Amino acid sequence: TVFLDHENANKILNRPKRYNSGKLEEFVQGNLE
Amino acid sequence: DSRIGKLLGFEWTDLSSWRRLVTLLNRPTDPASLAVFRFLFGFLMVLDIPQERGLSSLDRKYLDGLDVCRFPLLDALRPLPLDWMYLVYTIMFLGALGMMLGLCYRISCVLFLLPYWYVFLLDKTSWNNHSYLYGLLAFQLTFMDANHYWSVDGLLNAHRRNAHVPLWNYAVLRGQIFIVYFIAGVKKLDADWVEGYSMEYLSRHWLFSPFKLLLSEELTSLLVVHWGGLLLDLSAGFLLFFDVSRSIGLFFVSYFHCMNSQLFSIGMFSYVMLASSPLFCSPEWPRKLVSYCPRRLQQLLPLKAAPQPSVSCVYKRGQKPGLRHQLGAAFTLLYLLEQLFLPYSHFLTQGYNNWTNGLYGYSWDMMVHSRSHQHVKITYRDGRTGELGYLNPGVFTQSRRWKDHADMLKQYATCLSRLLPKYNVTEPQIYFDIWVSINDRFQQRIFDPRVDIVQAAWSPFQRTSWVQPLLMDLSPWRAKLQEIKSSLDNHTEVVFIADFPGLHLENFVSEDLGNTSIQLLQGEVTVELVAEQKNQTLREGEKMQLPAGEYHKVYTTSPSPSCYMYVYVNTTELALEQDLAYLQELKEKVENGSETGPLPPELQPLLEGEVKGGPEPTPLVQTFLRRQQRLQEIERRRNTPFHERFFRFLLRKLYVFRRSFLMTCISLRNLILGRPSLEQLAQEVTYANLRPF
Ligand SMILES: C/C(=C\Cc1c(C)c(O)c2ccccc2c1O)CCC[C@H](C)CCC[C@H](C)CCCC(C)C
Numbered sequence: 001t002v003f004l005d006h007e008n009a010n011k012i013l014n015r016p017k018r019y020n021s022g023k024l025e026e027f028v029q030g031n032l033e
Numbered sequence: 034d035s036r037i038g039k040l041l042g043f044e045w046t047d048l049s050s051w052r053r054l055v056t057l058l059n060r061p062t063d064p065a066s067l068a069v070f071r072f073l074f075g076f077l078m079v080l081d082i083p084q085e086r087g088l089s090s091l092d093r094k095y096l097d098g099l100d101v102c103r104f105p106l107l108d109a110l111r112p113l114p115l116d117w118m119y120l121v122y123t124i125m126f127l128g129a130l131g132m133m134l135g136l137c138y139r140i141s142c143v144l145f146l147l148p149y150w151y152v153f154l155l156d157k158t159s160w161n162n163h164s165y166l167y168g169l170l171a172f173q174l175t176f177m178d179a180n181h182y183w184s185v186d187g188l189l190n191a192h193r194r195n196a197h198v199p200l201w202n203y204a205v206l207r208g209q210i211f212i213v214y215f216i217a218g219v220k221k222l223d224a225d226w227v228e229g230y231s232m233e234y235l236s237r238h239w240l241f242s243p244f245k246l247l248l249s250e251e252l253t254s255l256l257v258v259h260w261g262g263l264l265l266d267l268s269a270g271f272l273l274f275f276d277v278s279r280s281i282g283l284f285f286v287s288y289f290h291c292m293n294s295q296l297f298s299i300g301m302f303s304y305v306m307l308a309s310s311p312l313f314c315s316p317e318w319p320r321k322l323v324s325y326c327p328r329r330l331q332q333l334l335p336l337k338a339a340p341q342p343s344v345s346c347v348y349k350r351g352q353k354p355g356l357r358h359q360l361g362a363a364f365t366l367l368y369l370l371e372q373l374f375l376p377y378s379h380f381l382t383q384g385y386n387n388w389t390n391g392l393y394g395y396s397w398d399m400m401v402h403s404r405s406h407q408h409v410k411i412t413y414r415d416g417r418t419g420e421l422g423y424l425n426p427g428v429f430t431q432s433r434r435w436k437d438h439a440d441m442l443k444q445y446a447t448c449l450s451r452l453l454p455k456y457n458v459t460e461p462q463i464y465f466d467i468w469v470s471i472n473d474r475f476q477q478r479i480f481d482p483r484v485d486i487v488q489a490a491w492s493p494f495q496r497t498s499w500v501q502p503l504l505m506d507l508s509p510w511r512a513k514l515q516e517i518k519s520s521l522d523n524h525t526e527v528v529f530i531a532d533f534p535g536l537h538l539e540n541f542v543s544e545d546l547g548n549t550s551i552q553l554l555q556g557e558v559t560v561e562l563v564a565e566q567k568n569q570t571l572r573e574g575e576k577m578q579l580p581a582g583e584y585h586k587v588y589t590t591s592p593s594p595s596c597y598m599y600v601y602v603n604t605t606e607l608a609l610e611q612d613l614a615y616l617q618e619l620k621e622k623v624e625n626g627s628e629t630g631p632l633p634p635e636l637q638p639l640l641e642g643e644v645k646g647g648p649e650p651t652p653l654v655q656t657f658l659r660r661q662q663r664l665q666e667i668e669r670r671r672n673t674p675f676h677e678r679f680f681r682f683l684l685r686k687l688y689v690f691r692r693s694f695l696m697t698c699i700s701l702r703n704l705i706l707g708r709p710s711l712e713q714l715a716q717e718v719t720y721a722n723l724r725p726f
Pocket residue numbers: 213214217257258261262265266285288289292293296297299302303306399400
């Protein structure tokens with residue numbers, strides 16, 4: 001987890017993690033973000 | 034008697050000289066409204082400390098032995114051990130209760146103010162406008178005499194029971210609220226708010242259901258949410274002040290804050306603002322409210338008799354004001370001027386500037402910027418061997434706000450430079466590459482991908498040289514791009530890129546994503562395939578089909594920025610969906626009586642629904658069963674009465690509060706009486722996490 005392979009490091013088109021996508025700064029996410 | 038005197042409450046001659054100004058700002062005034070606001074604010078902060086400040090979650094944020102990167106405003110600040118942090122939060126709670134009950138008011142205000150700002154400055158990732166507001170209100174109330182009415186300290190000391198208070202105690206508070214509105218109003222006069230780009234998806238919430246009866250959704254998302262909010266922010270401060278316009282202002286502001294409370298997860302902000310709004314009313318409203326009640330109730334409610342003379346007000350007979358009065362007037366003037374000036378103080382501290390202005394929290398620009406990140410690459414070069422490697426984007430971090438500010442990026446880079454050598458790495462050099470889009474623009478770099486952040490030069494009062502400018506010239510494209518987003522099927526997806534001259538982007542299309550294509554919208558680009566080392570030269574209006582499972586690089590070779598796009602479809606997902614549809618069709622055919630032939634043995638588990646006494650299901654069967662179970666669970670969740678939801682909400686909050694209290698108790702016991710055996714600690718920690726039920 002502390003290092004990522006060269007192949008997996010560059011995936012621009014990979015689906016972004018949909019965890020609070022399009023989030024505004026003024027929010028209390030909670031549960032350690 | 035003057036009309037101006039009636040509207041504004043004072044005559045011009047009162048401002049002629051400094052003495053008369055002090056007398057005006059220290060005139061007698063009734064304290065009831067201030068006391069009610071004190072009680073409400075104390076209650077709200079007491080309910081807020083176990084939830085948002087993070088006492089419920091503090092045992093896995095400052096955990097001992099964990100190596101994490103902090104973001105303090107000053108690098109000198111460092112957290113204490115966990116037990117002392119629990120003690121600090123206990124002091125906060127005691128101060129908040131003291132402010133609520135008005136017992137030892139000044140000590141309570143100090144005990145709440147100092148720890149709150151200590152925690153606030155210890156982490157820049159937890160800054161928000163509604164926290165800075167609580168800090169400012171706590172600072173103000175430390176000097177205001179809010180314990181003169183309805184306070185236990187009033188019972189303890191007779192001389193401070195139902196006594197007069199100076200006018201400035203109200204004035205500052207009123208001014209503060211006005212600023213909180215008015216500055217926001219001028220901050221929202223931006224091209225991204227008046228045009229409907231920010232918060233474009235907030236018009237679909239069901240609370241706006243009635244509005245859709247008279248207007249279309251597109252106009253409902255511009256006239257009501259955006260323009261209405263701006264008008265309310267600008268006008269509410271003036272509407273509440275004047276007597277004639279107070280009622281409509283209160284109604285509109287209450288409706289606005291209720292809708293904000295339901296729509297957002299701000300927390301206690303809306304309730305605090307609702308508590309503060311009546312403060313513009315007459316200073317004696319609670320007393321007349323208490324008067325208009327049955328005598329039986331009056332036997333328990335606060336007093337109704339007139340206030341007594343105090344020593345903290347200048348009375349006209351001529352009395353020469355002392356030192357408290359002059360200091361109060363000077364404090365009012367200076368504090369209001371500082372509050373007005375600070376939001377526009379970004380031309381001095383240019384180091385913290387970015388695409389937006391300054392750190393978030395002290396600008397009052399609420400909900401006027403949305404950011405959507407695409408990818409984050411952290412590359413490191415070892416300083417001894419020259420090997421080049423890549424780190425996980427969010428390692429040794431607890432927030433995700435380091436992707437948008439240069440100072441936080443520098444702090445994170447230094448933290449990595451200090452922690453990595455534990456992993457057999459010599460003095461490293463770290464490069465960052467971050468993609469971010471603000472209010473649905475082209476995705477562009479924010480930090481230069483060729484600059485070593487560890488050895489980069491950064492001071493608070495000098496502009497950073499490695500922050501890419503925002504390409505405002507491509508603002509109008511947001512229209513045309515949107516059309517393309519709505520002209521695609523249910524499977525295809527699009528990602529837009531805008532790149533500066535000289536730089537290049539290296540990408541590796543995953544094997545799953547077949548049929549990936551690149552189209553150029555503006556500029557001149559060159560696309561290189563490294564499998565055979567062949568580079569072509571693409572110009573405007575040209576489409577290419579890139580390989581899947583290999584690397585491709587794109588270079589920009591024009592004097593101006595180049596804008597292009599990726600269009601891709603997940604072929605594996607399409608195949609899985611088609612196969613699942615076929616399986617579901619066969620299942621329906623078997624169910625409805627068609628397909629009289631015997632079912633395949635693999636189909637028998639599907640009808641049975643349980644893998645018992647047979648071969649393990651195929652991956653497709655497992656996926657189908659999981660999807661069916663998920664759909665059934667969702668249907669069960671939706672078909673739920675309100676009372677169950679409310680009960681679950683209350684139980685979850687009760688669990689949070691109980692865990693907070695028990696964790697604080699164990700921490701205090703460990704600090705004071707020493708640490709018992711490790712088995713005892715394990716048992717007590719197990720007891721703390723027990724669900725109430
Ligand atoms: C989300 C909105 C504003 C951001 C915001 C927030 C979250 C706050 O916590 C604020 C607290 C204090 C001061 C300013 C704040 C602030 O700016 C607009 C929300 C708009 C609402 C949902 C629309 C309905 C209300 C309008 C005013 C009704 C007008 C009706 C017309 C026909 C006139």
